[PDB]
């Protein structure tokens, strides 16, 4: 019966929580007593990439740990050089409302999308010499919110119509679709093994898919408000999230429950993006308080504050080599912090 | 520097091109056309001649970028921040309803990002409103309306009801009734945008 399954749906919900609580015999907060904290991390602005004029929404480091891709309301997806500050490309977009940008792991491809319901994939190594649209990945109905490249041929997309999708760029068809979210899917973080990926959505729920089949494997519901930011832990067994809750929490893929909540009474601004350091000891989160706080992922205490933006710190990302951390802002000034 | 001076020259050219594109794009004006469903927004853009349908038109040396953001179904709170720093909302309301339009308006004008943005409230399809008030009393839609069913006071009442949702006197709501007329909607939009750019120009120089 319709009522019986709804009752058993709740009956399923509580007993998994009981099992989830059964494995909670200890917490990381007391285990971390045996190690030393990192102290004051006084990161300083080693650069300023002042090419954008309007609100650089999202950025992504290349695999080289040398190049950026930055998307902005200006309609220009310019890609930077982290040392020479040079603008090595300036791809002009079909629509200027881009919140998604992705740098392919091989460095060949750059993709961006947004309020146009279309993922545009750009080929940088064209023999004609200029970056041009490879394919446009029509098939979503809501706004795109994040893009990540598994490899040069397949891209995983998170959208506003509560469905993540996985495409192949060889023909542009939605080879695999995902479902199981109620709110708008906002952030997406591919695992290091590229065999799984977690996404956060507006319903405060984060879940880990397998990329081989459209089946969600686990669900996490620690937060109260929409999951703005999500990022896999470097080892791949854990991940953290950020929301309008003005606090970040760290989850475990195998323990299937929250491990930490990175909060303080003095912060009330929601999180805009998050990403870990190379070793995972250090967690960087970009608050709406016009600054990025650095959180010790183990002690949960604030390792310090990074400031220098006149508006939202909308994007944040550590290099694949751990060399530095760059933070794009609504001030249009891409800082390079180390 | 090695031959990477050629790369630096290319970067300087790219920076110059970004500056030129910034100058060229800023010469246009951006207008968000948020409004109720089936409120005749397509009509007000056609008269002026799947996501954001960034339709555009140019009037008297001024180029209007008219972003109809209603094409995609999602919660406004998640994408309305992209339309911060838009010069004016082209909010439109159909009179065939209706309280959903009132709720949407009360959400828009009091929104944090739009606390300083003017609103060109269009009252659309007034002829069918006249037909309805001839056929039915307005109390079926507004129980608290005490006036008679004549055209002028009912229109004034609904316009004032929309306007009363403002909670910041520094804004302004240039309510206007089109009645499916031609070339007047463009005129009021142009007058509104002229007032807005004059106000912004004053704010820049410090006269505000």
């Amino acid at each position, epitope marked *: 019966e319709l009522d019986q399954l709804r009752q058993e749906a709740e009956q399923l919900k509580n007993q998994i929580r009981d099992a989830r609580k059964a494995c909670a015999d200890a917490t990381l907060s007391q285990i971390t007593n045996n190690i030393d904290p990192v102290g004051r991390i006084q990161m300083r602005t080693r650069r300023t990439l002042r090419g954008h004029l309007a609100k650089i929404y999202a950025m992504h480091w290349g695999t080289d740990s040398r190049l950026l891709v930055s998307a902005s309301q200006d309609g220009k997806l310019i890609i930077w050089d982290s040392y020479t500050t040079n603008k090595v490309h300036a791809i002009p977009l079909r629509s200027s409302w881009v919140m998604t940008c992705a740098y392919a792991p091989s460095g060949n491809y750059v993709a961006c999308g947004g309020l146009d319901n279309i993922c545009s994939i750009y080929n940088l190594k064209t023999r004609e010499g200029n970056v041009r649209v490879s394919r446009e990945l029509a098939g979503h109905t809501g706004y795109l919110s994040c893009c990540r490249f598994l490899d040069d041929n397949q891209i995983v997309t998170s959208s506003g119509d509560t469905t993540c999708a996985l495409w192949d760029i060889e023909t542009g068809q939605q080879t695999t679709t995902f479902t199981g979210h109620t709110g708008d899917v906002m952030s997406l973080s591919l695992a290091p093994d590229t065999r799984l990926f977690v996404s956060g959505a507006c319903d405060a729920s984060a879940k880990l898919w397998d990329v081989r089949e459209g089946m969600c494997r686990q669900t996490f519901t620690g937060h109260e408000s929409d999951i703005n930011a999500i990022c896999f832990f470097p080892n791949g067994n854990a991940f953290a999230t950020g929301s309008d809750d003005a606090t970040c929490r760290l989850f475990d893929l195998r323990a299937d429950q929250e491990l930490m909540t990175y909060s303080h009474d003095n912060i009330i601004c929601g999180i805009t993006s998050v990403s870990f350091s190379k070793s995972g000891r250090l967690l960087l989160a970009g608050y709406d308080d016009f600054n990025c706080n650095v959180w010790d992922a183990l002690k949960a205490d604030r390792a310090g504050v990074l400031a220098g933006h006149d508006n939202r710190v909308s994007c944040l990302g550590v290099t694949d080599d751990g060399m530095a951390v760059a933070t794009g802002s609504w001030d249009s000034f891409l800082k390079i912090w180390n | 520097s090695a031959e990477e001076r050629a790369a630096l*020259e290319r970067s300087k*050219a790219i920076e110059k091109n970004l500056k030129e594109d910034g100058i060229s794009a800023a010469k246009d004006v951006k207008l968000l056309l948020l409004g109720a469903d089936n409120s005749g927004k397509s009509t007000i853009v056609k008269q002026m001649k799947t996501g954001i349908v960034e339709t555009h038109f140019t009037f008297k040396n001024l180029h209007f970028r008219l972003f109809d953001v209603g094409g995609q179904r999602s919660e406004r709170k998640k994408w309305i921040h992209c339309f911060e720093d838009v010069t004016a909302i082209i909010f439109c309301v159909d009179l065939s309803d209706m309280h959903e339009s009132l709720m949407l308006f009360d959400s828009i004008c009091n929104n944090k990002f739009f606390i300083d943005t003017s609103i060109i409230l269009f009252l659309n399809k007034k002829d069918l409103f006249g037909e309805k008030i001839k056929k039915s009393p307005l109390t079926i839609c507004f129980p608290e309306y005490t006036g008679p069913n004549t055209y002028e006071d009912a229109a004034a009442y609904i316009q004032a009801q929309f306007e009363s949702k403002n909670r910041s006197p520094n804004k302004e709501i240039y309510c206007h009734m089109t009645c499916a007329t031609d070339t007047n909607n463009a005129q009021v939009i142009f007058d509104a945008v002229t007032d807005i750019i004059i106000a912004n120009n004053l704010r820049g120089c410090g006269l505000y």
Partner: single-chain antibody
Framework: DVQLVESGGGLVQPGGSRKLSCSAS????????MHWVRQAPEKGLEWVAY????????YYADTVKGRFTISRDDPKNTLFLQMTSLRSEDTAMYYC??????????????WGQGTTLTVSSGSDIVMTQATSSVPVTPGESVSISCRSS???????????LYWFLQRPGQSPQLLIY???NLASGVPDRFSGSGSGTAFTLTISRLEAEDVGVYYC???????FGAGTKLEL
């Protein structure tokens, strides 16, 4: 479909002038530099001119400095070389090449088919080759080497030495750029390596198409060595 078609060759009386032209198609001309590398009928390659992207800067070889000029007509995608007061040494076949310079980019990807130019009778970096010819056989392995007057390793970590393959009766192509990176379309048989001032190119698992002359070029500052011909 990249094309660099050149025109304007023929016979020029000594002391005359001629406008060598390069016509480009199939690619964004304005985003690329240009060089007008030339080759004497019985000698190696020699750099001639370099026009940057958007004509920002221009360089000439000392032998044509002031004597010849280069210009690029971006709307028509055409590059011009204005050779003036030509001399006997100017009898050579000229090549029009591409170049895009940015991090990760490859200079000198494409070379035009070139045009022959003839006239009637009447503080610097140098690259030297340790051989002029080397016998080879299909399926065997070969190793070419070059040397320069000073180290090519800049402070930033790059090493701006190039390798070019010219098959007989054909225009050359890029094989290795920055001494270690394969150009597009070059089979993995070719592989360059070196350190300091002595640099080598290996052509292991030599296929029959590898026969030709291999030229090595420095690019630290504003040139091709003599080159060696592999004989099957």
């Amino acid at each position: 479909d990249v094309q660099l078609v050149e025109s304007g060759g023929g016979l020029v009386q000594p002391g005359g002038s001629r406008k060598l032209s390069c016509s480009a198609s199939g690619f964004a001309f304005s985003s690329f530099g240009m060089h007008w590398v030339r080759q004497a009928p019985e000698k190696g390659l020699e750099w001639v001119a370099y026009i940057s992207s958007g004509s920002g800067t221009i360089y000439y070889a000392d032998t044509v400095k002031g004597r010849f000029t280069i210009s690029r007509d971006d709307p028509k995608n055409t590059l011009f070389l204005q050779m003036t007061s030509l001399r006997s040494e100017d009898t050579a076949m000229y090549y029009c090449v591409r170049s895009i310079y940015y991090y990760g980019s490859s200079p000198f990807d494409f070379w035009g088919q070139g045009t022959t130019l003839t006239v009637s009778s009447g503080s610097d970096i140098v690259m030297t080759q340790a051989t002029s010819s080397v016998p080879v056989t299909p399926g065997e392995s070969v190793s070419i080497s070059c040397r320069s007057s000073k180290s090519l390793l800049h402070s930033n970590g790059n090493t701006y030495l190039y390798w070019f393959l010219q098959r007989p009766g054909q225009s050359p192509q890029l094989l290795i750029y920055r001494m270690s990176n394969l150009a597009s379309g070059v089979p993995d048989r070719f592989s360059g390596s070196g350190s300091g001032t002595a640099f080598t190119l290996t052509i292991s698992r030599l296929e029959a198409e590898d026969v030709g002359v291999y030229y090595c070029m420095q690019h630290l500052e504003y040139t091709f060595g003599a080159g060696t011909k592999l004989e099957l």
